[PDB]
Structures are given as structure tokens and as C-alpha cells.
Amino acid sequence: GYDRALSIFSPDGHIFQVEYALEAVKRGTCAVGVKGKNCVVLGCERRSTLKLQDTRITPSKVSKIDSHVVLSFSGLNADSRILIEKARVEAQSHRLTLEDPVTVEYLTRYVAGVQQRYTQSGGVRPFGVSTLIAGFDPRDDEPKLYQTEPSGIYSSWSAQTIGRNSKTVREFLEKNYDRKEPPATVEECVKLTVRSLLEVVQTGAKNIEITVVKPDSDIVALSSEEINQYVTQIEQEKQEQ
Amino acid sequence: FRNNYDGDTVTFSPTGRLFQVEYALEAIKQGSVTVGLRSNTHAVLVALKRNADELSSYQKKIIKCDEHMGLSLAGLAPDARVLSNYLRQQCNYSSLVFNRKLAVERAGHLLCDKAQKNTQSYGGRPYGVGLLIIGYDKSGAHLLEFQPSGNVTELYGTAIGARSQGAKTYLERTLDTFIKIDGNPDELIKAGVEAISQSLRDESLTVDNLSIAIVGKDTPFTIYDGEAVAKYI
């Protein structure tokens, strides 16, 4: 019944609801993704306004859309679930009709299409979410990393970050990621990720979670220790100078 | 005052006005000038086509509704496309169901009633386009002026758009002359060209600038553009 046009043009050619939807992303916890030569890595920061959580059950920041593609986000946690679900459903529908899992590009294009629709439909507000979608196309080894925003615009990055202090971490990556020689190892790819988060997270062993995606549905999330080891080795790179 | 009563078409002003409708009418005055005039055998539409750049085309202003009926536009082109298409259907319906060419007068009634519905209901907006309808039916030649307010008037001749008052005064004077141009299409068109040029100011009507349509006794509604209008410039 409700169809009030909430997302509309303003005198200066802006859609304030979409604009403010990005401000909700700037509020969300930092998410980052870097693509290596043979892998993609996704890093996210964990808040500390309240600490006493059960980490086993509490929803993790990186979600699987299919066995070969993952999606992380920044902004409203509630909104992201609605997007993640729709993506997972479409992932299955594509497998069912095309007889082939989605390409990271396609899955992204769909998630962007949903977001875009909410920017010009009646009685709805846009998603307060920006996403990072990463993985490997079926039977392909070339790494894929895409980003979407509430506007419905999407594009691929060699490395990107969204959320709070994403400005800071992007600068780091801009002057630390060489397109000529991308992190040729899973290890040095995760290292560059943690480094970029440490620019913002401010000593957070339990405040940093990493996920590594390799070709052919090879996805694994790193445990506190494995990451903590990277943190230990990085703080030495500084002190040894 | 006006600011409080012009938010939508569903609101009357304290003086009894519908500003949204009046604003729609203002879009016509900003539109390019077009002229209509009729004798007892033919009816002519002469429209000035407007261009954005010298690199753009001159936007078409005349639309054919049926073999015996057509109209010229002034204002928002898409709204002209909507109403002309609606009129096309009404002409098409009349033919198929009754094997009957729709009377020009009735076509006006239908355009009036459709425009009216957009002025009484919330959420909608008035049409932002003036329409001059010509046609040769079972009762001779006809010319109609359509206003987004829903007001449709049958006239011997008229003009709408920017500086349209020049052509309107001219026709009001040339009345006794052109009304008798029967059996001569070329003279009626020339009379329409002399009408439209009375509303010029910026330029002079060129070949890819002029648009003329005609209907009548033994002349199906046909549109002349470019080279075909050269003999009238």
C-alpha cells in the first residue's frame, strides 16, 4: 500500500537518501580486500563498544554466497542479511538454469541491481550497505574482487576498503600495492591485508578477522592465533628500525 | 498566497484557481509556435520546428492520428505523444467496431475528458502540452484547440506557443479571406505560412525548420517536411 517516493532528486541534483545511505557505510566497521596472483583476501575489523560476546554464534562479517564466492560489507548489519540472502538464492537459481555456478562479476552485477532498485522504488529506503564480493569464476584461476555501494554502482579493484577510516587504509594500499607485482603468495597477501587494517584497528588481535579464498571453492577463515602471528611479525618490521 | 495552493492539482486557491493547471499552460507558451486554419474544403497545420543546437534536428511537431485526422503540438513532447496515441486508439476503435470515421468534434470531447481526469485526482499532474487538431469528417473541415485545462474549442483558425499572438491577430483579420480558399490547398498553406511568420522574431523559416500538414475533401492527412516545403518559403 505504501509507495511514498523517499529517494528523490534535490535542487542540486542529489538523491539525499542514497547520499545518507553512504553515511551509514562510513559508520560501519572497516572492511578490506586485496587480490594476489592466485588468491583474494578479505579483512574486517571487530567493534569494541561492548565486549562480552560469544564469537562462535555471533554473525561473522564475511559470508559465503556460494562455495566459490564470498561477500563482506560495511554499514547496517540488518540490511546486509537481506542482500546476502537474495545473492545466495540467485546463486542457486543460476546453477539450476545455466548449469554452471555464477561468475563473481555476475553475482556482483545482481547484488548491485537489487541495491539500485531500492534507490528508485516507492515506499522503500536504499540499503545502508556497501559490499566487497570476491572469489574465482568457475574453472578459472584469475582472482576476482568487486565493490558495490547503495547507489547501485559496482566495479572491480586490485584492492579496496570500505567503512570507517576507509580513507586512511585506502591511502596505505595506494602506496603499498604494486600492480606490476601483486602479492604472489597467500602469505604476503594476508600480510599486506593485516598491515592495512593495523593502520586503523589500533592493536586488535581479536579485532581483526581474515578470510582467504583460493581457486576451486577453497575458502578458509584464519583463527586468532594465525592472524596474531602476522601482527607479531608486522610490529617487528617497525621496531627493527 | 500562491505558494500554499500550488503544491498539487487537487488544491483550489482562495480565488478559485488551479495553479498546477495554470503552470501546465505556461509550458505551452514556452513551446514553439504552431498555427492552424481551415476553409470549407481543407484544414492546414503550419508548425515552427525548434532546434537545440545547430548540430541537432528540429523536433517534429505534427502527428497523424488517422487518415482523416491529425494534430500539432506545443509544450511537452512526451505528453503530446501520449494524447496523440490515445486519440489514435479512439480513431482506431471507431473504425473497427462501427466501421465509422471518428468525428473531429468527438475526438475533442475525448481529449477534454482525458485531460480533466488529471486535474481532479491526487498524485497525478496535468498534461503540459497544447494541441491543435485538424480533420475532414462527415461535416466538412475542422480545427480544434486543446488546452491541458481540458478546454477544447472549435475555431476557423488559431495559434499556440511563443509569440503566438502575432499569428492569432493576423488570422482574426484574414478570416473573411482564407475561409473561402476552397479547392485550392496551395493557397491555404501559403495563408498559414503568412500566419506563422507573423510570430517570428529570432530567425526566418527555413527548409528544415518548417513543418506543414494538410487534410481535406480528397486529401488524406499528410505531413510535409524539408524539400517538400521549399516552394512555400
Binding site: 532528486f9 | 541537432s56 498524485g123
Partner: protein
């Protein structure tokens, strides 16, 4: 508040005019039509060096004989391209023939005014106009090579050459003096490439700018970075020549 399909005291639609302001903030797009083909060029305009520039898709194929370029809120363009592609293919299925470039453009513009909160005319379910202008370029046997400018207003003009986006008023003035009825395809390519260079904030290279064309023979093709790079090199040489 105030209706989404309200009239201004000057006889304009607020939402449509505000929509055009959004297009003024978009990446530059240029179209030039010649008797040898129509050329489409866009400013990629990446927001960061980490953004993989070739993933920016601002020139798209509607059919083999119709391609188009976008400017403004490029996200809004997806459903428009989709409608156009469907309209073309559907027409081919119904009549065993290519859709006319004008007819295709008319169909895309037919969506533009389908916005409102319940406007009495049909069922226009769309909360706002499109935030994107389209340059539709193609060829058909009836009217030859064509270039169209499709606005969110629903009106479409046919241009011999047209520019839309941030540097439009500047680029358009340039096109005014440079265009003539006997240009060759190559000449138009360099011409687009030159005018883009002038209006772009960034130094034009084969990575922040993209060319494409439509010719009766080979249809709509997007120029790969190598082919464009050579045309940029060719331009610089002809500019430094005098």
C-alpha cells in the same frame, strides 16, 4: 512535502530538472555522426588508481547495429539498456528485421516519464526519473547513420554531434566549429579524442578514456585499449604539427 510530478510556476517538472543537474555532474560522453559511421567516446574517470579501469562500462551494445553511451548516475542505466536490448530483440522476433534506431530510441524514452506516486494515466511505478542521459548511436537502411540524445524528460533529439556530462557546454561549443557534413570516420575518432582531452580533468590516455563506433559493415564495436592508444599518439602528432 511536494509531489514528485509537480509543475514549477515556469511550467517545468521539478524532478526532471533536478535530474538534469545530476547528469551535469557525470562523466563526459561525446557522439559524432558521419557518412562513414557514428563514433562514441567516454571519460572513464576512475576515483582511485586501485580501481581496475577496464571494468568501467559506460559504452554498451544494444544490438549489432545499435550501441549507446551513458552519462550521470550510470547505475540507473542498467534497466534502460535492458529494456532497449529486449525491445530490439523482441522487434526482430516479431518482424524478422532490425529495429529502426529512432524506434529503439523512442522506446527507451517511453520509460522516462513513468514515475510518480500514482499518476492517473496507467501504472507508472518508479519513484523518480532516471539520473542518466543516453547517447544512442546506430544505423538502419531507412535513415542511415544516426545519433540520438535521450534525456530523462522523455524527449530525444537527433544530433550530428553531441556532448553530455560535466564538460558538455564546453565540448558542445567545440563540436559546433569542428563538425562538417563530409567528415571521415578517422577524423571523428581524433575529434572525440581531442575534445575529451580538453574537458577531462585527467590527462587523456588509453586507460581513462574509451572509444567505440558503429558502421554498416561491422556494426557496433568497442575499441580495445591498444587501438585507442595509437589514435591518441596520432592525435598528439597532428596537434604538435601546428
Amino acid at each position: 512535502d511536494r509531489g514528485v510530478s509537480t509543475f514549477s510556476p515556469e511550467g517545468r517538472l521539478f524532478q526532471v530538472e533536478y535530474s538534469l543537474e545530476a547528469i551535469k555532474l557525470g562523466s563526459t560522453a561525446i557522439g559524432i555522426a558521419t557518412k562513414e559511421g557514428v563514433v562514441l567516446g567516454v571519460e572513464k574517470r576512475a576515483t582511485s588508481p586501485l580501481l581496475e579501469s577496464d571494468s568501467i562500462e559506460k559504452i554498451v551494445e544494444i544490438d549489432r547495429h545499435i550501441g549507446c553511451a551513458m552519462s550521470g548516475l550510470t547505475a540507473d542505466a542498467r534497466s534502460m539498456i535492458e529494456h532497449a536490448r529486449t525491445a530490439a530483440v523482441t522487434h526482430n522476433l516479431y518482424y524478422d528485421e532490425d529495429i529502426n534506431v529512432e524506434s529503439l530510441t523512442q522506446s527507451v524514452c517511453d520509460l522516462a516519464l513513468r514515475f510518480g506516486e500514482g499518476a492517473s494515466g496507467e501504472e507508472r511505478l518508479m519513484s523518480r526519473p532516471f539520473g542518466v542521459a543516453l547517447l544512442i548511436a546506430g544505423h538502419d537502411a531507412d535513415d542511415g547513420y544516426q545519433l540520438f540524445h535521450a534525456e530523462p524528460s522523455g524527449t530525444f533529439y537527433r544530433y550530428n554531434a553531441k556532448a553530455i556530462g560535466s564538460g558538455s557546454e564546453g565540448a558542445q561549443a567545440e563540436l559546433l566549429n569542428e563538425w562538417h557534413s563530409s567528415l571521415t570516420l578517422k577524423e571523428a575518432e581524433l575529434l572525440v579524442l581531442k575534445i575529451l582531452k580538453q574537458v577531462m580533468e585527467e590527462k587523456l590516455d588509453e586507460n581513462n578514456a574509451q572509444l567505440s563506433c558503429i558502421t554498416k559493415q561491422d556494426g557496433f564495436k568497442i575499441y580495445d585499449n591498444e587501438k585507442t592508444a595509437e589514435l591518441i599518439k596520432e592525435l598528439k602528432e597532428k596537434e604538435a604539427a601546428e
